[PDB]
Amino acid sequence: ESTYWEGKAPPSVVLGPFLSKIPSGVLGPASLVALIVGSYCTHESNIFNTLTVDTIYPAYVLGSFLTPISWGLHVAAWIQKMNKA
Amino acid sequence: VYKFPKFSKALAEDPSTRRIWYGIATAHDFESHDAMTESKLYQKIFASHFGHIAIIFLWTAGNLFHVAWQGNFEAWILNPLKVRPIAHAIWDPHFGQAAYKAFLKTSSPANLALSGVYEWWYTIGMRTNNDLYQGSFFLILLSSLLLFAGWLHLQPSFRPSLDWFKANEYRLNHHLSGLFGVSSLAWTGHLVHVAIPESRGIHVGWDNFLTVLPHPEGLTPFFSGNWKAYAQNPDTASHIFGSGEGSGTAILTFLGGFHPQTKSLWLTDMAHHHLAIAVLFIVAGHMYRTNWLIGHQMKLILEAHRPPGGRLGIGHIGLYETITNSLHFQLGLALAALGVATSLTAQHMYALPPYAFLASNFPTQAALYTHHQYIAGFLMVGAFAHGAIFFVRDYDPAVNTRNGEKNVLARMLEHKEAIISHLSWVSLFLGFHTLGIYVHNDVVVAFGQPEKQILVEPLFAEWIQAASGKTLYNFDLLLASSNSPASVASSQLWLPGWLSAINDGKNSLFLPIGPGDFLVHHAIALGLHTTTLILVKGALDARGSKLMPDKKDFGYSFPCDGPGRGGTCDISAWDAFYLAMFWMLNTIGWVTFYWHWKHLTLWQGNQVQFNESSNYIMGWLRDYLWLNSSPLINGYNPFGMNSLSVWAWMFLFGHLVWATGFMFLISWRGYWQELIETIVWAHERTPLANLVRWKDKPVALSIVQARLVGLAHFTIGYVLTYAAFVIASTIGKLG
Amino acid sequence: MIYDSQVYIALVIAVVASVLAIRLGATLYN
Amino acid sequence: SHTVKIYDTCIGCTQCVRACPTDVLEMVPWDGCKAGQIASAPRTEDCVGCKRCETACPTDFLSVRVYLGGETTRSLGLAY
Amino acid sequence: HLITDGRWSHGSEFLLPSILFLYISGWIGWVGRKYIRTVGQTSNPTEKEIIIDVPLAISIMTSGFLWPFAAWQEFLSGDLIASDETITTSP
Amino acid sequence: GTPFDTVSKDELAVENKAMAGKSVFERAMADFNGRYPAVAALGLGPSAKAERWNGRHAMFGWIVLLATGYAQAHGLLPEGGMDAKEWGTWVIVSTTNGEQVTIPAARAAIAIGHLHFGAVGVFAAYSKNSVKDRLLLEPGEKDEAPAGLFPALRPGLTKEAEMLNGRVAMLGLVALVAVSAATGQDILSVIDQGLGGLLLK
Amino acid sequence: AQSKALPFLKAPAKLDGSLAGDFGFDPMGISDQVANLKYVRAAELKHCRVAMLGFLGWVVQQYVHLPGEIYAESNPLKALTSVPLLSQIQIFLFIGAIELATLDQTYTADKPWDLGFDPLNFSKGKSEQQMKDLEVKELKNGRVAMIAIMGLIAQTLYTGVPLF
Ligand code: CLA
Ligand code: CLA
Ligand code: CLA
Ligand SMILES: CC(/C=C/C=C(C)/C=C/[C@@]12O[C@]1(C)C[C@@H](O)CC2(C)C)=C\C=C\C=C(C)\C=C\C=C(C)\C=C\[C@@]12O[C@]1(C)C[C@@H](O)CC2(C)C
Ligand SMILES: CC(/C=C/C=C(C)/C=C/[C@@]12O[C@]1(C)C[C@@H](O)CC2(C)C)=C\C=C\C=C(C)\C=C\C=C(C)\C=C\[C@@]12O[C@]1(C)C[C@@H](O)CC2(C)C
Ligand SMILES: CC(/C=C/C=C(C)/C=C/[C@@]12O[C@]1(C)C[C@@H](O)CC2(C)C)=C\C=C\C=C(C)\C=C\C=C(C)\C=C\[C@@]12O[C@]1(C)C[C@@H](O)CC2(C)C
Ligand SMILES: CC1=C(/C=C/C(C)=C/C=C/C(C)=C/C=C/C=C(C)/C=C/C=C(C)/C=C/C2=C(C)CCCC2(C)C)C(C)(C)CCC1
Ligand code: SF4
The CA-to-CA distance between both ends of chain F, in Å, stands at 73
Q: Do G107 and B158 make contact, defined as CB atoms within 8 angstroms?
A: yes
Q: Quick one: B30 exposed, middle or buried, by C-beta within 10 A (0-12, 13-18, 19+)?
A: middle
Find the residues whose C-beta lies inside 6 A of ligand 4: F 24, 28, 54, 57-58, 60-62, 64-65, 170, 173-174; G 97, 100-101, 104
- Ligand 1 mean position, distance from CA B298 (Å): 19
Using CA atoms, how far residue B98 sits from B147, B599, G93, in Å, is: 44, 33, 49
| DSSP code, position E2 | B
Q: Residue B315 in contact with residue B402, Cβ under 8 Å?
A: no
Q: How many CB atoms lie within 10 A of CB F33?
A: 16
Query: Interior CA angle at B45 toward B44 and B51, to 5°?
Result: 90
Using CA atoms, how far residue D34 sits from D28, D58, E4, in Å, is: 14, 15, 69
Task: Give the CA radius of gyration of chain B.
Answer: 29
Pick from B133, B141, B147: which is nearest to C21 by CB? B147
Nearest listed ligand to the Cα of residue D57? 8
In C1-30, beta strands by DSSP E: none
Q: Residue B43 in contact with residue B153, Cβ under 8 Å?
A: yes
- Ligand 8 mean position, distance from CA G136 (Å): 76
Evaluated on CA atoms B174, B177, B180, B182, the torsion sign reads negative
Nearest atom (ligand 8) to Cα of D46: 5
| For ligand 8, atom 6: residue with the closest CA | D47
Q: Residue B479 in contact with residue B467, Cβ under 8 Å?
A: yes
Residue of G146, G152, G158 with the most ligand 6 atoms within 8 Å of its CB, for mutation: G152
Three-class SS of B513-574: CCHHHHHHHHHHHHHHHHHHHHHHHHHHHHHCCCCCCCHHHHCCCCCECCCCCCCCECCCHH
Q: Residue B95 in contact with residue F89, Cβ under 8 Å?
A: yes
Q: Do D70 and B14 make contact, defined as CB atoms within 8 angstroms?
A: yes
Q: Residue B718 in contact with residue B585, Cβ under 8 Å?
A: yes
How far is residue E35's CA from residue E31's CA, in Å, rounded to a whole number? Answer: 6
Backbone φ and ψ for D40, nearest 5 degrees, come out as -135, 160
Do D and F touch, counting CB pairs below 8 Å (3 needed)? no
Q: Do G110 and F1 make contact, defined as CB atoms within 8 angstroms?
A: no
Three-class SS of B27-41: CCCHHHCCCCCHHHH
User: Among residues B721, B717, B712, which one has the least CA distance to residue B665?
Assistant: B712
**What number of CA atoms fall less than 13 Å from residue G15's CA on the CB side?**
24
Three-class SS of B218-259: CCHHHHHCCHHHHCCCCCCCCCCCCCCCCCCCCCCCCCCCCC
**Chain G residue numbers touching F1 (CB-CB < 8 A):** 29, 32-33
Nearest atom (ligand 6) to Cα of G122: 16
Nearest listed ligand to the Cα of residue E71? 3
| For ligand 1, atom 36: residue with the closest CA | B179
Backbone φ and ψ for B417, nearest 5 degrees, come out as -65, -40
Residue type, E75: F
Q: How many CB atoms lie within 10 A of CB F156?
A: 7
Using CA atoms, how far residue B674 sits from B671, B680, C20, D52, D79, in Å, is: 6, 10, 48, 20, 11
- Ligand 4 mean position, distance from CA F61 (Å): 13
Q: Which residues pair with A73 in a beta bridge?
A: none
Q: Residue B376 in contact with residue B346, Cβ under 8 Å?
A: yes
CA quadruple D61, D62, D68, D69: dihedral, nearest 10? 100
Query: Residue B261 contacts by C-beta under 8 Å, 6 or more apart in sequence?
Result: B239, B240, B241
3-state helix, strand, coil in chain C (%, to 5): 80, 0, 20
Would you say the CB of residue G156 lies under 6 angstroms from ligand 6? no
Residue F196 region by backbone torsions, left for phi larger than 0, else alpha for psi between -120 and 50, else beta:
left
Question: Treating both helix axes as pointing N-terminal to C-terminal, what angle do B129-152 and B38-70 enclose, rounded to 10 degrees?
Answer: 170
How far is residue G3's CA from residue G23's CA, in Å, rounded to a whole number? Answer: 6
Task: Say what the resolution is, in angstroms.
Answer: 3.0
Chains sharing 3 or more CB pairs under 8 A with chain A:
B
| For ligand 5, atom 11: residue with the closest CA | F60
Q: Do F14 and B155 make contact, defined as CB atoms within 8 angstroms?
A: no
Q: Quick one: B318 exposed, middle or buried, by C-beta within 10 A (0-12, 13-18, 19+)?
A: buried
Would you say the CB of residue F171 lies under 6 angstroms from ligand 5? yes
B230 annotated binding-site participant:
no
| For ligand 8, atom 7: residue with the closest CA | D53
Using CA atoms, how far residue E77 sits from B572, C7, E68, E73, in Å, is: 41, 85, 15, 7
Q: Residue F127 in contact with residue F121, Cβ under 8 Å?
A: no
Tell me how long chain A is: 85
Three-class SS of B635-660: CEECCEECCCHHHHHHHHHHHHHHHH
Q: Which residues of chain B approach chain E closer than 8 Å at the C-beta?
A: 397, 413-414, 416-417, 454-457, 459-460, 515, 540-541, 543-546, 549-550, 552
Looking at chain B, which residue has its C-alpha nearest residue A6?
A: B308
Q: Residue G62 in contact with residue G163, Cβ under 8 Å?
A: yes
Q: Do B44 and C28 make contact, defined as CB atoms within 8 angstroms?
A: yes
- Ligand 6 mean position, distance from CA G75 (Å): 19
Would you say the CB of residue B153 lies under 6 angstroms from ligand 1? no
Would you say the CB of residue B53 lies under 6 angstroms from ligand 1? yes
User: Among residues B564, B566, B573, which one has the least CA distance to residue B545?
Assistant: B573
Q: How many CB atoms lie within 10 A of CB B668?
A: 14
Minimal CA separation from A30 to chain B, in Å: 23
Using CA atoms, how far residue B20 sits from B17, B470, B530, B697, F196, in Å, is: 6, 60, 35, 11, 61
b/e G111-122 (16+ beta carbons within 10 angstroms → b): ebbebeeeeeee
**What number of CA atoms fall less than 13 Å from residue B18's CA on the CB side?**
23
How far is residue B113's CA from residue B109's CA, in Å, rounded to a whole number? Answer: 13
Nearest atom (ligand 7) to Cα of B340: 12
Query: Residue F137 contacts by C-beta under 8 Å, 6 or more apart in sequence?
Result: F41, F42, F43, F47, F49, F143
Would you say the CB of residue F64 lies under 6 angstroms from ligand 5? no
How far is residue F145's CA from residue B715's CA, in Å, rounded to a whole number? Answer: 56
Query: Residue A68 contacts by C-beta under 8 Å, 6 or more apart in sequence?
Result: A38
Nearest atom (ligand 8) to Cα of D19: 3
Evaluated on CA atoms B478, B479, B483, B484, the torsion sign reads positive
Backbone φ and ψ for F139, nearest 5 degrees, come out as -60, 115
- Ligand 1 mean position, distance from CA B171 (Å): 8
How far is residue B140's CA from residue E67's CA, in Å, rounded to a whole number? Answer: 73
Would you say the CB of residue B383 lies under 6 angstroms from ligand 7? yes
How far is residue B449's CA from residue B445's CA, in Å, rounded to a whole number? Answer: 5
Minimal CA separation from A13 to chain B, in Å: 10
Report the structure determination method. Answer: cryo-EM
Residue type, F183: T
Query: Residue B556 contacts by C-beta under 8 Å, 6 or more apart in sequence?
Result: B388, B389, B392, B393, B542, B572, B573, B574
How far is residue B382's CA from residue B388's CA, in Å, rounded to a whole number? Answer: 10
DSSP letters of chain F?
--SS-SS-TTS-----GGGSS-THHHHHHHHHHHHSTTTTTTT-SSSHHHHHHHHHHHHHHHHHHHHHHHHHHTT-S--SB--HHHH-GGGEEEESSS-EEE-BHHHHHHHHHHHHHHHHHHHHHTTGGGSSS-SS--BTB-------SS-----SS-HHHHHHHHHHHHHHHHHHHHHHHHH---HHHHHHHHTTTSS--
Q: Which residues pair with B423 in a beta bridge?
A: none
Tell me how long chain D is: 80
User: Among residues F187, F191, F169, which one has the least CA distance to residue F58?
Assistant: F169
- Ligand 2 mean position, distance from CA B32 (Å): 15
| DSSP code, position D44 | G
Looking at chain F, which residue has its C-alpha nearest residue G106?
A: F15
Minimal CA separation from C26 to chain F, in Å: 8
Residue type, B306: R
Residue contacts between B and G (CB atoms, under 8 Å): 17
**Chain G residue numbers touching F179 (CB-CB < 8 A):** none
Chains sharing 3 or more CB pairs under 8 A with chain E:
B
Q: Residue B235 in contact with residue B250, Cβ under 8 Å?
A: yes
User: Among residues B533, B568, B536, B565, which one has the least CA distance to residue B554?
Assistant: B568
| For ligand 2, atom 5: residue with the closest CA | B331
Would you say the CB of residue F173 lies under 6 angstroms from ligand 5? no
Query: Residue B657 contacts by C-beta under 8 Å, 6 or more apart in sequence?
Result: B713, B714, B716, B717, B720
| DSSP code, position B355 | S
Query: Residue G56 contacts by C-beta under 8 Å, 6 or more apart in sequence?
Result: none
Residue type, G150: M
The H or E element containing residue D66 is: strand D64-67
User: Among residues B481, B483, B462, which one has the least CA distance to residue B473?
Assistant: B462
Would you say the CB of residue B390 lies under 6 angstroms from ligand 7? yes
The CA-to-CA distance between both ends of chain A, in Å, stands at 18
| For ligand 2, atom 41: residue with the closest CA | B25
Query: Residue B688 contacts by C-beta under 8 Å, 6 or more apart in sequence?
Result: none
User: Among residues F54, F94, F55, F102, which one has the least CA distance to residue F78?
Assistant: F102
Would you say the CB of residue B57 lies under 6 angstroms from ligand 1? no
Find the farthest-apart pair of alpha carbons in chain E and give their distance in angstroms, rounded: 55
User: Among residues D20, G107, B584, G164, which one has the least CA distance to residue C27?
Assistant: G107
**Chain C residue numbers touching F35 (CB-CB < 8 A):** 26
Q: Residue G38 in contact with residue G112, Cβ under 8 Å?
A: yes
CA quadruple B264, B266, B267, B271: dihedral, nearest 10? -120
